[PDB]
mmCIF file of all heavy atoms in Angstrom:
data_model
loop_
_atom_site.group_PDB
_atom_site.id
_atom_site.type_symbol
_atom_site.label_atom_id
_atom_site.label_comp_id
_atom_site.label_asym_id
_atom_site.label_seq_id
_atom_site.Cartn_x
_atom_site.Cartn_y
_atom_site.Cartn_z
ATOM 1 N N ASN Q 29 181.772 -16.905 33.658
ATOM 2 C CA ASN Q 29 182.531 -17.759 34.611
ATOM 3 C C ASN Q 29 183.917 -18.056 34.096
ATOM 4 O O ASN Q 29 184.873 -17.890 34.842
ATOM 5 C CB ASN Q 29 181.676 -19.031 34.908
ATOM 6 C CG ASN Q 29 182.458 -20.067 35.696
ATOM 7 O OD1 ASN Q 29 183.413 -20.628 35.204
ATOM 8 N ND2 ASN Q 29 182.057 -20.285 36.914
ATOM 9 N N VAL Q 30 184.054 -18.407 32.800
ATOM 10 C CA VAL Q 30 185.410 -18.617 32.270
ATOM 11 C C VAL Q 30 186.214 -17.359 32.413
ATOM 12 O O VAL Q 30 187.410 -17.405 32.795
ATOM 13 C CB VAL Q 30 185.344 -19.087 30.795
ATOM 14 C CG1 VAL Q 30 186.705 -18.860 30.115
ATOM 15 C CG2 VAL Q 30 185.091 -20.582 30.755
ATOM 16 N N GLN Q 31 185.656 -16.170 32.195
ATOM 17 C CA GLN Q 31 186.483 -14.934 32.258
ATOM 18 C C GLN Q 31 186.790 -14.607 33.697
ATOM 19 O O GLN Q 31 187.956 -14.551 34.104
ATOM 20 C CB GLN Q 31 185.815 -13.753 31.568
ATOM 21 C CG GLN Q 31 184.939 -14.091 30.427
ATOM 22 C CD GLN Q 31 184.460 -12.885 29.718
ATOM 23 O OE1 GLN Q 31 185.197 -11.899 29.582
ATOM 24 N NE2 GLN Q 31 183.217 -12.941 29.229
ATOM 25 N N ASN Q 32 185.755 -14.327 34.497
ATOM 26 C CA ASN Q 32 185.887 -13.964 35.891
ATOM 27 C C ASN Q 32 186.791 -14.935 36.629
ATOM 28 O O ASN Q 32 187.622 -14.495 37.414
ATOM 29 C CB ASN Q 32 184.479 -13.939 36.483
ATOM 30 C CG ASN Q 32 183.693 -12.725 35.991
ATOM 31 O OD1 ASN Q 32 184.111 -12.045 35.094
ATOM 32 N ND2 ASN Q 32 182.492 -12.567 36.508
ATOM 33 N N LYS Q 33 186.672 -16.228 36.384
ATOM 34 C CA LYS Q 33 187.564 -17.194 36.989
ATOM 35 C C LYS Q 33 189.023 -16.981 36.549
ATOM 36 O O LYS Q 33 189.881 -16.646 37.369
ATOM 37 C CB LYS Q 33 187.111 -18.634 36.695
ATOM 38 N N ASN Q 34 189.287 -17.090 35.253
ATOM 39 C CA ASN Q 34 190.660 -16.907 34.739
ATOM 40 C C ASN Q 34 190.859 -15.530 34.155
ATOM 41 O O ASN Q 34 191.305 -15.370 33.013
ATOM 42 C CB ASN Q 34 190.967 -17.996 33.693
ATOM 43 C CG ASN Q 34 190.279 -19.289 33.911
ATOM 44 O OD1 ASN Q 34 190.492 -19.971 34.908
ATOM 45 N ND2 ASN Q 34 189.458 -19.681 32.959
ATOM 46 N N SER Q 35 190.537 -14.518 34.955
ATOM 47 C CA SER Q 35 190.630 -13.139 34.442
ATOM 48 C C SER Q 35 192.052 -12.667 34.237
ATOM 49 O O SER Q 35 192.307 -11.600 33.686
ATOM 50 C CB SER Q 35 189.912 -12.200 35.445
ATOM 51 O OG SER Q 35 190.564 -12.191 36.698
ATOM 52 N N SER Q 36 193.023 -13.498 34.716
ATOM 53 C CA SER Q 36 194.454 -13.266 34.509
ATOM 54 C C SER Q 36 194.862 -13.393 33.053
ATOM 55 O O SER Q 36 195.785 -12.689 32.592
ATOM 56 C CB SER Q 36 195.260 -14.258 35.358
ATOM 57 O OG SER Q 36 195.743 -15.361 34.642
ATOM 58 N N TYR Q 37 194.155 -14.217 32.265
ATOM 59 C CA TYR Q 37 194.567 -14.434 30.885
ATOM 60 C C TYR Q 37 193.838 -13.539 29.886
ATOM 61 O O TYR Q 37 193.833 -13.853 28.681
ATOM 62 C CB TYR Q 37 194.366 -15.888 30.479
ATOM 63 C CG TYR Q 37 195.155 -16.856 31.322
ATOM 64 C CD1 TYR Q 37 194.522 -17.906 31.994
ATOM 65 C CD2 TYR Q 37 196.515 -16.746 31.444
ATOM 66 C CE1 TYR Q 37 195.236 -18.801 32.764
ATOM 67 C CE2 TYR Q 37 197.255 -17.605 32.208
ATOM 68 C CZ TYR Q 37 196.598 -18.640 32.873
ATOM 69 O OH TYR Q 37 197.295 -19.491 33.647
ATOM 70 N N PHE Q 38 193.242 -12.468 30.348
ATOM 71 C CA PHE Q 38 192.552 -11.506 29.492
ATOM 72 C C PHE Q 38 193.108 -10.123 29.784
ATOM 73 O O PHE Q 38 193.013 -9.663 30.928
ATOM 74 C CB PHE Q 38 191.033 -11.509 29.721
ATOM 75 C CG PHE Q 38 190.361 -12.822 29.393
ATOM 76 C CD1 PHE Q 38 190.224 -13.765 30.385
ATOM 77 C CD2 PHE Q 38 189.932 -13.078 28.137
ATOM 78 C CE1 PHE Q 38 189.588 -14.973 30.089
ATOM 79 C CE2 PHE Q 38 189.328 -14.278 27.843
ATOM 80 C CZ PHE Q 38 189.153 -15.229 28.798
ATOM 81 N N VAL Q 39 193.589 -9.435 28.729
ATOM 82 C CA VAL Q 39 194.176 -8.107 28.981
ATOM 83 C C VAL Q 39 193.094 -7.148 29.483
ATOM 84 O O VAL Q 39 191.935 -7.191 29.077
ATOM 85 C CB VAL Q 39 194.824 -7.497 27.703
ATOM 86 C CG1 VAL Q 39 195.912 -8.402 27.156
ATOM 87 C CG2 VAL Q 39 193.870 -7.101 26.666
ATOM 88 N N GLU Q 40 193.546 -6.316 30.386
ATOM 89 C CA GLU Q 40 192.752 -5.255 31.053
ATOM 90 C C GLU Q 40 192.739 -3.939 30.305
ATOM 91 O O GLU Q 40 191.966 -3.089 30.669
ATOM 92 C CB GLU Q 40 193.284 -5.114 32.497
ATOM 93 N N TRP Q 41 193.509 -3.772 29.221
ATOM 94 C CA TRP Q 41 193.381 -2.549 28.478
ATOM 95 C C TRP Q 41 192.471 -2.687 27.269
ATOM 96 O O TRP Q 41 192.343 -1.727 26.529
ATOM 97 C CB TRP Q 41 194.774 -2.036 28.054
ATOM 98 C CG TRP Q 41 195.718 -3.115 27.620
ATOM 99 C CD1 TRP Q 41 196.543 -3.853 28.383
ATOM 100 C CD2 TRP Q 41 195.888 -3.602 26.268
ATOM 101 N NE1 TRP Q 41 197.227 -4.771 27.614
ATOM 102 C CE2 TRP Q 41 196.853 -4.638 26.310
ATOM 103 C CE3 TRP Q 41 195.329 -3.236 25.046
ATOM 104 C CZ2 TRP Q 41 197.252 -5.302 25.189
ATOM 105 C CZ3 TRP Q 41 195.720 -3.929 23.904
ATOM 106 C CH2 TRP Q 41 196.707 -4.933 23.993
ATOM 107 N N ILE Q 42 191.831 -3.822 27.061
ATOM 108 C CA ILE Q 42 190.717 -3.870 26.102
ATOM 109 C C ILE Q 42 189.462 -4.329 26.849
ATOM 110 O O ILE Q 42 189.198 -5.556 26.880
ATOM 111 C CB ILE Q 42 191.005 -4.764 24.902
ATOM 112 C CG1 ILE Q 42 192.283 -4.370 24.164
ATOM 113 C CG2 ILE Q 42 189.856 -4.690 23.912
ATOM 114 C CD1 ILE Q 42 192.666 -5.359 23.086
ATOM 115 N N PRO Q 43 188.662 -3.423 27.362
ATOM 116 C CA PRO Q 43 187.496 -3.810 28.177
ATOM 117 C C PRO Q 43 186.486 -4.554 27.330
ATOM 118 O O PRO Q 43 186.330 -4.307 26.150
ATOM 119 C CB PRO Q 43 186.941 -2.483 28.683
ATOM 120 C CG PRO Q 43 188.120 -1.521 28.545
ATOM 121 C CD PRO Q 43 188.815 -1.950 27.320
ATOM 122 N N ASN Q 44 185.799 -5.478 27.986
ATOM 123 C CA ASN Q 44 184.753 -6.306 27.373
ATOM 124 C C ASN Q 44 185.165 -6.874 26.061
ATOM 125 O O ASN Q 44 184.572 -6.545 25.002
ATOM 126 C CB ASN Q 44 183.494 -5.490 27.242
ATOM 127 C CG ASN Q 44 183.125 -4.720 28.476
ATOM 128 O OD1 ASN Q 44 183.136 -3.481 28.480
ATOM 129 N ND2 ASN Q 44 182.815 -5.464 29.551
ATOM 130 N N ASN Q 45 186.184 -7.713 26.065
ATOM 131 C CA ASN Q 45 186.791 -8.172 24.793
ATOM 132 C C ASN Q 45 186.349 -9.574 24.408
ATOM 133 O O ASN Q 45 186.783 -10.058 23.363
ATOM 134 C CB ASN Q 45 188.313 -8.092 24.860
ATOM 135 C CG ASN Q 45 188.882 -8.896 25.977
ATOM 136 O OD1 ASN Q 45 188.156 -9.355 26.834
ATOM 137 N ND2 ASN Q 45 190.201 -9.091 25.973
ATOM 138 N N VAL Q 46 185.509 -10.242 25.190
ATOM 139 C CA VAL Q 46 184.955 -11.541 24.833
ATOM 140 C C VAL Q 46 183.505 -11.350 24.415
ATOM 141 O O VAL Q 46 182.655 -11.022 25.242
ATOM 142 C CB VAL Q 46 185.064 -12.560 25.964
ATOM 143 C CG1 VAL Q 46 184.853 -13.901 25.406
ATOM 144 C CG2 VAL Q 46 186.414 -12.464 26.637
ATOM 145 N N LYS Q 47 183.187 -11.541 23.139
ATOM 146 C CA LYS Q 47 181.792 -11.472 22.712
ATOM 147 C C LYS Q 47 181.294 -12.880 22.397
ATOM 148 O O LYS Q 47 182.087 -13.786 22.082
ATOM 149 C CB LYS Q 47 181.611 -10.554 21.486
ATOM 150 C CG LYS Q 47 182.726 -9.559 21.280
ATOM 151 C CD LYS Q 47 182.669 -8.465 22.260
ATOM 152 C CE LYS Q 47 181.357 -7.751 22.313
ATOM 153 N NZ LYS Q 47 181.458 -6.950 23.542
ATOM 154 N N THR Q 48 179.965 -13.060 22.495
ATOM 155 C CA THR Q 48 179.347 -14.377 22.308
ATOM 156 C C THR Q 48 178.112 -14.227 21.400
ATOM 157 O O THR Q 48 177.357 -13.268 21.513
ATOM 158 C CB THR Q 48 178.886 -14.979 23.623
ATOM 159 O OG1 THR Q 48 179.805 -14.631 24.672
ATOM 160 C CG2 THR Q 48 178.850 -16.497 23.500
ATOM 161 N N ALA Q 49 177.926 -15.208 20.513
ATOM 162 C CA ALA Q 49 176.774 -15.279 19.646
ATOM 163 C C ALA Q 49 176.151 -16.664 19.812
ATOM 164 O O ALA Q 49 176.855 -17.628 20.176
ATOM 165 C CB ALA Q 49 177.181 -15.049 18.170
ATOM 166 N N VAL Q 50 174.852 -16.772 19.510
ATOM 167 C CA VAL Q 50 174.155 -18.037 19.496
ATOM 168 C C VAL Q 50 173.390 -18.196 18.219
ATOM 169 O O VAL Q 50 172.662 -17.259 17.804
ATOM 170 C CB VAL Q 50 173.229 -18.223 20.685
ATOM 171 C CG1 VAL Q 50 172.474 -19.544 20.493
ATOM 172 C CG2 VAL Q 50 174.019 -18.247 21.976
ATOM 173 N N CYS Q 51 173.531 -19.372 17.553
ATOM 174 C CA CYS Q 51 172.728 -19.746 16.412
ATOM 175 C C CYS Q 51 172.043 -21.076 16.728
ATOM 176 O O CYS Q 51 172.652 -21.970 17.292
ATOM 177 C CB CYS Q 51 173.601 -19.865 15.162
ATOM 178 S SG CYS Q 51 172.979 -20.906 13.833
ATOM 179 N N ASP Q 52 170.744 -21.173 16.386
ATOM 180 C CA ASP Q 52 169.949 -22.369 16.718
ATOM 181 C C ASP Q 52 170.336 -23.612 15.939
ATOM 182 O O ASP Q 52 170.245 -24.714 16.471
ATOM 183 C CB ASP Q 52 168.440 -22.122 16.478
ATOM 184 C CG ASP Q 52 167.878 -20.997 17.300
ATOM 185 O OD1 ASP Q 52 168.519 -20.530 18.262
ATOM 186 O OD2 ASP Q 52 166.750 -20.578 16.977
ATOM 187 N N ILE Q 53 170.707 -23.464 14.687
ATOM 188 C CA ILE Q 53 171.062 -24.560 13.797
ATOM 189 C C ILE Q 53 172.376 -25.186 14.248
ATOM 190 O O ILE Q 53 173.419 -24.464 14.265
ATOM 191 C CB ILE Q 53 171.117 -24.094 12.333
ATOM 192 N N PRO Q 54 172.438 -26.446 14.649
ATOM 193 C CA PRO Q 54 173.733 -27.044 15.020
ATOM 194 C C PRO Q 54 174.450 -27.611 13.818
ATOM 195 O O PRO Q 54 173.860 -27.724 12.719
ATOM 196 C CB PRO Q 54 173.322 -28.167 15.998
ATOM 197 C CG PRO Q 54 171.892 -28.435 15.701
ATOM 198 C CD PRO Q 54 171.324 -27.326 14.928
ATOM 199 N N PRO Q 55 175.716 -27.992 13.933
ATOM 200 C CA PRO Q 55 176.373 -28.707 12.871
ATOM 201 C C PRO Q 55 175.763 -30.083 12.693
ATOM 202 O O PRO Q 55 174.926 -30.540 13.515
ATOM 203 C CB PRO Q 55 177.853 -28.801 13.328
ATOM 204 C CG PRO Q 55 177.732 -28.697 14.819
ATOM 205 C CD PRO Q 55 176.609 -27.739 15.098
#
């Protein structure tokens, strides 16, 4: 949603450039 919504602020010559990870242990 952040990307698709503000897709203007992400360059189009590097496809799929936002990666995401999840870790269960919080700070």
Side-chain angles (χ1 to χ4, degrees), residues 29-32 34-39 41-52 54-55:
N29 170 294
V30 162
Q31 331 187 35
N32 289 9
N34 327 297
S35 65
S36 100
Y37 300 125
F38 297 92
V39 304
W41 39 274
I42 305 172
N44 313 116
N45 56 352
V46 196
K47 339 286 305 167
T48 325
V50 176
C51 158
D52 299 347

